[PDB]
Amino acid sequence: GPEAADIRVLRGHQLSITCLVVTPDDSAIFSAAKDCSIIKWSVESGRKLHVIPRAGKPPGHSSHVLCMAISSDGKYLASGDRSKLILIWEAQSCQHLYTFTGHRDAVSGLAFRRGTHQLYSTSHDRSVKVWNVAENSYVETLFGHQDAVAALDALSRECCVTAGGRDGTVRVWKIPEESQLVFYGHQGSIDCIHLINEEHMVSGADDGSVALWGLSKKRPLALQREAHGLRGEPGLEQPFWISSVAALLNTDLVATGSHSSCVRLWQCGEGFRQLDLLCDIPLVGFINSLKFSSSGDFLVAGVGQEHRLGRWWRIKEARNSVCIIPL
């Protein structure tokens, strides 16, 4: 059980963190925030390795970055923003390489196909797009979601998964098969998603539910209601909404984040048919992003005083920080 005395709180962002990635070699973290900057941090020292400031016209973002992805070889960083752009960077040097245009609204989810330089994106424009980063090329656009798309993840197969926000679907995009599997589940807005292995994923919803899914089955394999508890009055309590989820690849460990003052670790039961609470990790604020290290030695939380998508709520006791949680 990691406590405050264990969690390194990295300060630098001027506003709420919206997303982050950990480099495959676990040496560095890239974070982005509502300040429109991207910061590269050293995991070992906690110091900044590079800062890409808000945007001669030097490269950078002029509006919020909402999502980021890093390729499995650690070569490319992709960052998607409210300007409808995906910026591509050399992750080693933070040198700008390319800008993908084509989305018609904010870019909301990004993931590289593991073992390749193929990039999948999704957007408030309701589309999923496929790009080849090695060749700075656009490949194709896929449709299905009925509303703005909330999130996207991918692993090694020519496939990606999306959280549909308000359309209440999780969709599985089988690209060469030219097929889309549609799943319906844990109610309200499906706001975050992460693959656990090639055949299973975890999602979080604005009604506080955390669901486990398998690719075969159209309904969740498991569903934990009110996963971060409640606030309010008898008969009218409102559940804490799930703002981030993460899974440690090829294991049974998942993490969830809300604004309930703790990050929760869960263990998936046999066949992913149950979610069991392992521990509460104390951490105040909106848990806007969660990512496990490759080693599983640590978990990284991106924390904001505000929710990653808006200004509706403020937690003044929180700090806009990248938090390294040793496991």
Swiss-Prot record:
<dbReference type="GO" id="GO:0032040">
    <property type="term" value="C:small-subunit processome"/>
</dbReference>
<keyword id="KW-0832">Ubl conjugation</keyword>
<keyword id="KW-0488">Methylation</keyword>
<feature type="repeat" description="WD 4">
    <location>
        <begin position="144"/>
        <end position="183"/>
    </location>
</feature>
<keyword id="KW-0539">Nucleus</keyword>
<comment type="function">
    <text>Component of a nucleolar small nuclear ribonucleoprotein particle (snoRNP) thought to participate in the processing and modification of pre-ribosomal RNA (pre-rRNA). Part of the small subunit (SSU) processome, first precursor of the small eukaryotic ribosomal subunit. During the assembly of the SSU processome in the nucleolus, many ribosome biogenesis factors, an RNA chaperone and ribosomal proteins associate with the nascent pre-rRNA and work in concert to generate RNA folding, modifications, rearrangements and cleavage as well as targeted degradation of pre-ribosomal RNA by the RNA exosome.</text>
</comment>
<dbReference type="GO" id="GO:0031428">
    <property type="term" value="C:box C/D methylation guide snoRNP complex"/>
</dbReference>
<dbReference type="GO" id="GO:0003723">
    <property type="term" value="F:RNA binding"/>
</dbReference>
<keyword id="KW-0698">rRNA processing</keyword>
<feature type="repeat" description="WD 5">
    <location>
        <begin position="185"/>
        <end position="223"/>
    </location>
</feature>
<keyword id="KW-0687">Ribonucleoprotein</keyword>
<feature type="repeat" description="WD 6">
    <location>
        <begin position="237"/>
        <end position="276"/>
    </location>
</feature>
<comment type="subunit">
    <text>Interacts specifically with the U3 small nucleolar RNA (U3 snoRNA). Binds a sub-fragment of the U3 snoRNA surrounding the B/C motif (3UBC). This association with the U3BC RNA is dependent on the binding of a protein called 15.5K to the box B/C motif. The association of the protein with the U3BC RNA was found to be also dependent on a conserved RNA structure that flanks the box B/C motif. Part of the small subunit (SSU) processome, composed of more than 70 proteins and the RNA chaperone small nucleolar RNA (snoRNA) U3.</text>
</comment>
<feature type="repeat" description="WD 3">
    <location>
        <begin position="102"/>
        <end position="141"/>
    </location>
</feature>
<keyword id="KW-0007">Acetylation</keyword>
<comment type="similarity">
    <text>Belongs to the WD repeat RRP9 family.</text>
</comment>
<keyword id="KW-0853">WD repeat</keyword>
<feature type="repeat" description="WD 1">
    <location>
        <begin position="12"/>
        <end position="51"/>
    </location>
</feature>
<dbReference type="GO" id="GO:0005654">
    <property type="term" value="C:nucleoplasm"/>
</dbReference>
<dbReference type="GO" id="GO:0042274">
    <property type="term" value="P:ribosomal small subunit biogenesis"/>
</dbReference>
<keyword id="KW-0677">Repeat</keyword>
<keyword id="KW-0694">RNA-binding</keyword>
<keyword id="KW-0597">Phosphoprotein</keyword>
<keyword id="KW-1017">Isopeptide bond</keyword>
<dbReference type="GO" id="GO:0030515">
    <property type="term" value="F:snoRNA binding"/>
</dbReference>
<feature type="repeat" description="WD 7">
    <location>
        <begin position="282"/>
        <end position="323"/>
    </location>
</feature>
<protein>
    <recommendedName>
        <fullName>U3 small nucleolar RNA-interacting protein 2</fullName>
    </recommendedName>
</protein>
<dbReference type="GO" id="GO:0034511">
    <property type="term" value="F:U3 snoRNA binding"/>
</dbReference>
<dbReference type="GO" id="GO:0005730">
    <property type="term" value="C:nucleolus"/>
</dbReference>
<feature type="repeat" description="WD 2">
    <location>
        <begin position="60"/>
        <end position="99"/>
    </location>
</feature>
<dbReference type="GO" id="GO:0006364">
    <property type="term" value="P:rRNA processing"/>
</dbReference>
